[PDB]
């Protein structure tokens, strides 16, 4: 298997780990802060997905420093992940087009 496909795969597996640790970590940081809503694992996991996708419902988000830190990591991990898939896709098309041109 080519690099770009392996990397993409890797990024996905890595993202899923970050989603999970993120959820856990988020709860850990958020409990104790008055008025925090990011305080149970299940929604925390939903919060991590939307965070990774940069979706934006705003139904949930962190209010503590560490919570937000964890958040930044999930955002980055997510954007990088999805951007890497795009690169992978671009590389695929580029290679095929070259073929279709005889190169």
């Amino acid at each position, epitope marked *: 298997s080519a690099l770009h496909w392996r990397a993409a795969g890797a990024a996905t597996v890595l993202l899923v780990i970050v989603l999970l640790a993120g959820s856990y970590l988020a*709860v*850990l940081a958020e409990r*104790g802060a*008055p*008025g925090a809503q990011l*305080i*149970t694992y299940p929604r925390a996991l939903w919060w991590s997905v939307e965070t990774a996708t940069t979706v934006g419902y705003g139904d949930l988000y962190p209010v503590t420093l560490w919570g937000r830190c964890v958040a930044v990591v999930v955002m980055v991990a997510g954007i990088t992940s999805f951007g890497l898939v795009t690169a992978a896709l671009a590389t695929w098309f580029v290679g095929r087009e070259q073929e279709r041109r005889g190169h």
Partner: antibody
Amino acid sequence: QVQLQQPGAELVKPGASVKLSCKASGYTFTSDWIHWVKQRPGHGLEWIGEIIPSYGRANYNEKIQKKATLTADKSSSTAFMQLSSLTSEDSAVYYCARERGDGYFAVWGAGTTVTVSS
Amino acid sequence: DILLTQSPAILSVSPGERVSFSCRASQSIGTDIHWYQQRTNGSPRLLIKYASESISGIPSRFSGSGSGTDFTLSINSVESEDIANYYCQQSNRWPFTFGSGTKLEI
């Protein structure tokens, strides 16, 4: 089988301190939090604080004077609440409970009756 | 912090009659409300989770409804074993909090 085991009672002289215990059994997850709830005779339930054994961090009710300090022993599956410098106001039944990180207390201990008297 | 108001403090009902406990939250908390039963000298026992979810082991007689700020715990055809104190507890925001309770009287 009884998931949470707590001592029936503890007698404490005014000013002294006591350490209550809560031995847990059954399924244990890294996401488990152990809670402590105080209940004075004839009155309602009052949340004291929580602790997550897998990490060891604890949170406490800010609305009330902090009389407790929570700790946990992973090897023995036991959670401890140290109540210090007690008075008659601290006399009550103290329950410990288990929350699977999903917001509700699935199970409670039988509670420990604490009496502050000379 | 979220304040849970349980009124009336005492509810009187005739046997076999349907009864409804009320729990109002100081602010919208979705359905993250949970109910517990506490009989004389006993420990609290989960009856309903997330406002309306049933708990295995609990009589089909118990049911919950409500979302937002107004929640209700209902008992169809009350019976003696139902005599106890009833509390609501929210887990929507930190820290978790409990209602002041309501006593069922037959």
